Amino acid sequence: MQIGFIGVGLMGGPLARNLIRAGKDVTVYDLSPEAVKKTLAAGNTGKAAASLADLADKDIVFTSLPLPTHVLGVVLGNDGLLEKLKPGATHIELSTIDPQTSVKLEAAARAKGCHFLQCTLGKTPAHAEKAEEPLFIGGDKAIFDELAALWPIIGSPAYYMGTVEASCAVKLISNMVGMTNLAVLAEGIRIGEKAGIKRSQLLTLLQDTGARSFQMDVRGPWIANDDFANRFGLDLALKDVRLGCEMAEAWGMKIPAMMAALGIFKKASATGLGSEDCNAIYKVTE
Amino acid sequence: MQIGFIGVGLMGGPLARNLIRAGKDVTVYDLSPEAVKKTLAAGNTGKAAASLADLADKDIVFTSLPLPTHVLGVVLGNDGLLEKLKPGATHIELSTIDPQTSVKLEAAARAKGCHFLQCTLGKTPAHAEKAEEPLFIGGDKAIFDELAALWPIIGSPAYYMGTVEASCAVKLISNMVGMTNLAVLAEGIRIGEKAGIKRSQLLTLLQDTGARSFQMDVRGPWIANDDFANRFGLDLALKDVRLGCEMAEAWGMKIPAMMAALGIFKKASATGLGSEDCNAIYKVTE
Numbered sequence: 024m025q026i027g028f029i030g031v032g033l034m035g036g037p038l039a040r041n042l043i044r045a046g047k048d049v050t051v052y053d054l055s056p057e058a059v060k061k062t063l064a065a066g067n068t069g070k071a072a073a074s075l076a077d078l079a080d081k082d083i084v085f086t087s088l089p090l091p092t093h094v095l096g097v098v099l100g101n102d103g104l105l106e107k108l109k110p111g112a113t114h115i116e117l118s119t120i121d122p123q124t125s126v127k128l129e130a131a132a133r134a135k136g137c138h139f140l141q142c143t144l145g146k147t148p149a150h151a152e153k154a155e156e157p158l159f160i161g162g163d164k165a166i167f168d169e170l171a172a173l174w175p176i177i178g179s180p181a182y183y184m185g186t187v188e189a190s191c192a193v194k195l196i197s198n199m200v201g202m203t204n205l206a207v208l209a210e211g212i213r214i215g216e217k218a219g220i221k222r223s224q225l226l227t228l229l230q231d232t233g234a235r236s237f238q239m240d241v242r243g244p245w246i247a248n249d250d251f252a253n254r255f256g257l258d259l260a261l262k263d264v265r266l267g268c269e270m271a272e273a274w275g276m277k278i279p280a281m282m283a284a285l286g287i288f289k290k291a292s293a294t295g296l297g298s299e300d301c302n303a304i305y306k307v308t309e
Numbered sequence: 310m311q312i313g314f315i316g317v318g319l320m321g322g323p324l325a326r327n328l329i330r331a332g333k334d335v336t337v338y339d340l341s342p343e344a345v346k347k348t349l350a351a352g353n354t355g356k357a358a359a360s361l362a363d364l365a366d367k368d369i370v371f372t373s374l375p376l377p378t379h380v381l382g383v384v385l386g387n388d389g390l391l392e393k394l395k396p397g398a399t400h401i402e403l404s405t406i407d408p409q410t411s412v413k414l415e416a417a418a419r420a421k422g423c424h425f426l427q428c429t430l431g432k433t434p435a436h437a438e439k440a441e442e443p444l445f446i447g448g449d450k451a452i453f454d455e456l457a458a459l460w461p462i463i464g465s466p467a468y469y470m471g472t473v474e475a476s477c478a479v480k481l482i483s484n485m486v487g488m489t490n491l492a493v494l495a496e497g498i499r500i501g502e503k504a505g506i507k508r509s510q511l512l513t514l515l516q517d518t519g520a521r522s523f524q525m526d527v528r529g530p531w532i533a534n535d536d537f538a539n540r541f542g543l544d545l546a547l548k549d550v551r552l553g554c555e556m557a558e559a560w561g562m563k564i565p566a567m568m569a570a571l572g573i574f575k576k577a578s579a580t581g582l583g584s585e586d587c588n589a590i591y592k593v594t595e
Contacts, residue, residue, distance in 0.1 A: 122504065145518055157517065182514060184506070192504035193514055200497040200520035203566060204490060210564045211486040214553075217560045218408065218478035220470070228468060228479055231443065232431055234486035236522035267500075274503045277595055278496045279569035280489060286565060309563055 035087025321373025
């Protein structure tokens with residue numbers, strides 16, 4: 024069985040590597056030659072692609088790219104990927120994109136005679152390396168079921184979301200809620216500082232209250248040690264939060280608290296600290 | 310040793326009861342005659358007060374009242390409580406008030422020759438009944454140390470916050486962060502509904518992500534079952550959040566996400582669902 028894999032970036036690369044380690048016939052296509060080298064170095068069963076048309080014979084094509092614009096550009100041009108596919112081929116989309124975009128992708132695929140699944144990824148690239156990341160698969164239940172043997176190779180539990188928009192939405196919501204939780208935690212810590220409470224003590228005390236959150240337990244200590252080393256890049260956070268905020272709002276929503284979080288992430292990125300971790304928004308919270 | 314206790318309401322009543330059960334000489338003063346009866350029924354060692362001047366001989370006076378306006382009115386009139394106190398008496402203030410107010414209270418007490426501690430209370434009245442609620446004590450370290458034998462009777466760990474404003478602030482921050490966490494969780498759940506994800510499944514999935522929070526685990530199920538029975542009254546939440554937001558802002562702050570939470574709580578109270586639990590803000594989230 025013949026797999027193509029466009030984009031072996033930070034989360035896509037680990038899934039492609041796991042496919043290669045499992046002996047599958049993966050041919051990677053990435054504009055970064057050494058992303059390709061890194062992923063291709065996991066076994067002798069994976070090969071690189073000279074151009075996009077090298078993926079035309081493929082039975083399954085994975086896509087993992089940074090922006091919805093990129094997925095549409097690679098898959099949906101006249102000289103894009105979808106026009107070169109066998110009917111019956113399946114496009115699995117791993118990118119954290121918005122529901123509008125992936126619905127457009129799915130209708131393209133169905134209109135040509137191809138199958139399409141959205142498959143957004145949870146947790147860390149560290150998890151994805153071990154296939155211990157959740158998969159949120161949406162799309163035609165027939166294809167999710169048909170591909171039952173594939174999923175354990177790439178992901179943790181294979182959650183079936185039903186619709187493709189659910190698949191995008193659960194990923195975006197988890198990042199919206201987590202990053203807003205973090206922005207709110209930063210607001211709390213900064214308030215405590217105006218009351219003369221050291222961050223350390225404030226965290227220790229809040230730990231046994233109803234204010235507790237995963238971000239509190241995980242990133243509170245880092246903020247308390249002025250540690251902003253990249254774990255989840257601030258500009259990655261901002262990208263995903265902005266995308267989710269656009270996704271709502273396209274649905275007519277208001278989500279004021281999350282919009283405020285979006286604002287603080289934008290302000291931090293503008294301060295030029297987009298390469299630091301999420302918690303760097305603390306540095307611009309006031 | 311002679312204790313007076315003004316306000317045996319929802320959190321004050323359990324502490325007064327615990328003082329009575331421990332055999333202490335507590336005389337309660339409350340404008341609700343049957344709050345007094347309920348608290349006074351915990352033993353034969355506690356008695357009721359005909360008027361405020363019945364508390365004039367007292368060595369320690371606890372105050373637990375709903376608004377900062379009420380504490381100032383009871384303690385700081387010309388015919389208020391403080392004028393009738395022995396020098397050397399101690400005013401312990403249990404109310405969730407703002408730092409401006411309790412600093413005013415403390416300066417009044419020191420200017421008369423009395424001692425003053427702020428002692429805000431964490432967790433639930435259920436906890437307070439068993440003295441398993443945290444105490445955040447701020448004020449003169451000498452008095453906190455002198456009263457070392459008293460604290461285990463009324464509270465869980467006796468945390469010493471140092472300054473009185475720290476004592477107010479840690480209570481308010483915990484409620485600000487917790488209620489904003491809840492408003493943000495409501496935003497996430499409501500977004501998931503616009504994507505066609507049932508609340509149940511969205512919660513189950515978000516539980517194993519970085520969006521997890523105490524409010525998620527505790528009140529997520531209730532929202533998922535359309536259960537809004539009072540656990541923490543929405544109007545109580547709104548009161549405390551508004552107070553904390555005023556406390557910041559008096560410090561020149563902006564805290565946008567928390568201000569948005571304040572807005573949604575105000576909107577819910579205006580919809581007339583102030584007697585339901587916190588999570589009822591979900592009903593007006595959009």
